[PDB]
Amino acid sequence: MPNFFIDRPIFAWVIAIIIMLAGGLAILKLPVAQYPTIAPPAVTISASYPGADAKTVQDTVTQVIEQNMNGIDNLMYMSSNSDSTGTVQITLTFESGTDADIAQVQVQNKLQLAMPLLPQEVQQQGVSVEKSSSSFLMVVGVINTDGTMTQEDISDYVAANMKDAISRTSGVGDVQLFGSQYAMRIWMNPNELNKFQLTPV
């Protein structure tokens, strides 16, 4: 071969420049990250009951979901954590390498079988299914330099005019807001209620 490459040295330069341009276009098109997705895909189910104790939720929601969580592909294990605050979290960790999108379906489809057995309280709040990682990529804090807005006001502005678009952005699996969006709060007084002969009902 080199006996043909001495007579034609341009052919060696051309193929090298072809390989160099192929690498030049590669660096410009290839995505940059620190580490690749090495983790086994884990889909999470999350429901909430307002003002319900541990035993009241774990017996109701968890058991009704776990029992309907059957007939799923490449599943490794199911780990459900449920606490006194009301929230529950069933995690279905699938075999490393499985279609994250397809695996997330089977979960939601089976969850819809358990959906009418969840109490109205849980259904109203809404149960979510997400194919998300347990680590935060970044945190975008928001502060008021003028002091015109309170902690609850910043929490509401970020929720009502920021979280909406940020959550819709592709790649974002879950957004955790460090506060709460405003709500119409009706703080009842029992003495005034008893006086006018009324109940929370």
Partner: protein, 733 residues
């Protein structure tokens, strides 16, 4: 994703009200753009360092121009094939580039020196000089592509999380190796015969007239000093074969005593704090602890800290009034000099101050290398309630194991429950008969209790063109104490208001604040660590034995970091063994015998000695970067070894020279490239060893092992390789 988030917020910026400003207290993006920049800097520095080593031996600028044009074409080519196999520019892929540079420069340095060698010995024109130069190494280079691939390729068959880490390196190096051999036949020969100036026979740069002449005279004298030394050592084959037994025994001792830890903890510039208060602790009490924590970073760590984002009522396990977190951000890596200003030391200093905190547990820690993988830092054990004994019985069973495991600190360390301990809870008994007797329904009572004390979502409402909830709940003061229950009245059928005191009896009972259920059945998480000097499998086997002595109906299972095992010691050597058998085959096909292959099979422990010596003295462990670094030193030491025995074999078969006459005449021709190889590689991987800041942790682990390993792979192998060929041509002839 992150750059799009920055773009999203930039479009929201002009509509923000007066005062509203964005702050970044936690970010992994700056570390990514500085780790890649540090690797690309080291890769560029290696091009300059290889050029300077080339100029010392090849005095001409045009002679050094060929490998400096050959090296980029491999690196760029690897990115092109990296995109084809669905990979990306990560630290794992880029650290493979800094390893492969030495392997690619070796194929480029051997071809350029040989054309320079034949022009100075016979005085042939560049056309025929390169053709005859390639005539001896054409079979060697194709063989190099067959031997080197066989070493790295089996490291892709590893399974699970830790398995995919090795899969990134396994293909990246092989692809770069395949391209280097391809360009060493396509581009390197064509340039050797067109760019290089013809040399007259007999000249060795004796002309002097500067500093280069002093080096050329020193080199020619040392070559003759080496060939006389190699002749003397070859006569007494006995003692040096015995010396090799001390080397292989010493290698086995250092390899087993060296600890194993995968992926080193890096200074990412950001870390976190865990705030955990006792049972029944309030938000106010947690904020008192969090303020104390925030105070420390802002007063006792001013020069290191940049921003603290403390969050009350949010933890790692989940929500709770007694749980807190603190996303701590630090100043620039350059602005924090020394080991004391690094995340490793800051976290230690923080925990020492946070240890002295009354009625609260607080500890700060660095990120576990990658996202939330953390398959290291010990193991996790579960306690299944297989018979349905109940939570109260499963707590007692868990207490028995934790007590029986703590009495053996020689095998198990820090055996603790991950869950939360049983908090007292106020039980209210609505008497069904008493309610029906008074004229109040259970539906009215339950609604009155639920909506007041727990809060109730009524319906929705619109606030500035946005649907929001409407919540009904009692005022804070009327729902803080147990006696506040009597203050609540329910309307009966006769219009009479009856208090809760009339139809309910309330008392204090015990219950779990967080119940765990692993695989449908009730469970309890037990987190522990293997004692210093003891393996994870030895610690797991003891926990499996302690669980046998546990009450009936209580089972056990391993989850996450315990479900997945560490590859090293399990199937990793066994995968180097199929690589050993495949390697024997690819070289046997080139040597055309079963005896000769063993000569290059014995050069393997010569390269490992230097890798172990460097890792042991520095304090570094047997990690992924060390294991892939070990793989590099094996393939590179073999590359130098194969070329010596090929040059000795070719003259023996193609030429009329014997055994001794063929070795001494080939080893003098081969002394130049091996010395050029090591001097370019050791100096090339030198910035990684001295590196500080971001990426340094992995840089040191890749550097030292491949640098140290190369020292012995060229010092010991240069004298051992001819001895390995003379002992194999004597036993089988």
């Amino acid at each position: 994703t992150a750059a799009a988030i920055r773009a999203e917020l930039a479009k929201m910026e002009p509509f923000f009200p007066s005062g509203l400003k964005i702050v970044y207290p936690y970010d992994t993006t700056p570390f990514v753009k500085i780790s890649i920049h540090e690797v690309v800097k080291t890769l560029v520095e290696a091009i300059i360092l290889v050029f300077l080593v080339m100029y010392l031996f090849l005095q001409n600028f045009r002679a050094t121009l060929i490998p400096t044009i050959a090296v980029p074409v491999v690196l760029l080519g690897t990115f092109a094939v990296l995109a084809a196999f669905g990979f990306s520019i990560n630290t794992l892929t880029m650290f493979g580039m800094v390893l492969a540079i030495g392997l690619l420069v070796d194929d480029a340095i051997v071809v350029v020196e040989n054309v320079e060698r034949v022009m100075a010995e016979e005085g042939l024109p560049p056309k025929e000089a390169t053709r005859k130069s390639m005539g001896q190494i054409q079979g060697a280079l194709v063989g190099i592509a067959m031997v080197l691939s066989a070493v790295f390729v089996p490291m892709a068959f590893f399974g699970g999380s830790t398995g995919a880490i090795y899969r990134q390196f396994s293909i990246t190096i092989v692809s770069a190796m395949a391209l280097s051999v391809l360009v060493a036949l396509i581009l390197t020969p064509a340039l050797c015969a067109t760019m290089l100036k013809p040399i007259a026979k007999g000249d060795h740069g004796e002309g002097k007239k500067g500093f280069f002449g002093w080096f050329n005279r020193m080199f020619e004298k040392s070559t003759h000093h080496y060939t006389d030394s190699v002749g003397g050592i070859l006569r007494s084959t006995g003692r040096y074969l015995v010396l090799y037994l001390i080397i292989v025994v010493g290698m086995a001792y250092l390899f087993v005593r060296l600890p194993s830890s995968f992926l080193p903890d890096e200074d990412q510039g950001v870390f976190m704090t865990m705030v955990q208060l006792p049972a029944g602790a309030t938000q106010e009490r947690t904020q008192k602890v969090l303020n104390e924590v925030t105070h420390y970073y802002l007063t006792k760590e001013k020069n290191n800290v940049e921003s603290v984002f403390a969050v009350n009522g949010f933890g790692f396990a989940g929500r709770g009034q007694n749980t807190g977190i603190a996303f701590v951000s630090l100043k620039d890596w350059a602005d924090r000099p020394g080991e004391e200003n690094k995340v490793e030391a800051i976290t230690m200093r923080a925990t020492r101050a946070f240890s002295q905190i009354k009625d609260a547990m607080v500890f700060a820690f660095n990120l576990p290398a990658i996202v939330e993988l953390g398959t290291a830092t010990g193991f996790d054990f579960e306690l299944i309630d297989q018979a349905g004994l109940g939570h109260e019985k499963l707590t007692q069973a868990r207490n028995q194991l934790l007590a029986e495991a703590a009495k053996h600190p020689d095998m198990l360390t820090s055996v603790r429950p991950n869950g939360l301990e049983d908090t007292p809870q106020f039980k209210i008994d609505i008497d069904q008969e008493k309610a029906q007797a008074l004229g109040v329904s259970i539906n009215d009572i339950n609604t009155t209790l639920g909506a007041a004390w727990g809060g109730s979502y009524v319906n929705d409402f619109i606030d500035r063109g946005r649907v929001k909830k409407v919540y009904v709940m009692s005022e804070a003061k009327y729902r803080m104490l147990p006696d506040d229950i009597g203050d609540w009245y329910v309307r009966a059928a006769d219009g009479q208001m009856v208090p809760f005191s009339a139809f309910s009896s309330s008392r204090w009972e015990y219950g779990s604040p967080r119940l765990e259920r692993y695989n449908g059945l009730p469970s309890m998480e037990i987190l522990g660590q293997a004692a210093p000097g003891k393996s994870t499998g030895e610690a797991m086997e003891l926990m499996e034995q302690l669980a046998s002595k546990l009450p009936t109906g209580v089972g056990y299972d391993w989850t996450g970091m315990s479900y997945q095992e560490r590859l090293s010691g399990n199937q990793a050597p066994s995968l180097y063994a199929i690589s050993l058998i495949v390697v024997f085959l690819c070289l046997a096909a080139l040597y055309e015998s079963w005896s000769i292959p063993f000569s290059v099979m014995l050069v393997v422990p010569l390269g490992v000695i230097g890798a172990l010596l460097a890792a042991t003295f520095r304090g570094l462990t047997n990690d992924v970067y060390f294991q892939v670094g070990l793989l590099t030193t094996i393939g590179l030491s073999a590359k130098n070894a194969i070329l010596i025995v090929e040059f000795a074999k070719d003259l023996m078969d193609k030429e009329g020279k014997g055994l001794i006459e063929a070795t001494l005449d080939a080893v003098r021709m081969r002394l130049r490239p091996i010395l050029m190889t090591s001097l370019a590689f050791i100096l090339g991987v030198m910035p990684l060893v001295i590196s500080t800041g971001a990426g340094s942790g992995a840089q040191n682990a890749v550097g030292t092992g491949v640098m140290g390993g190369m020292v012995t792979a060229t010092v010991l192998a240069i004298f051992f390789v001819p001895v390995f060929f003379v002992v194999v041509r004597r036993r089988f002839s």
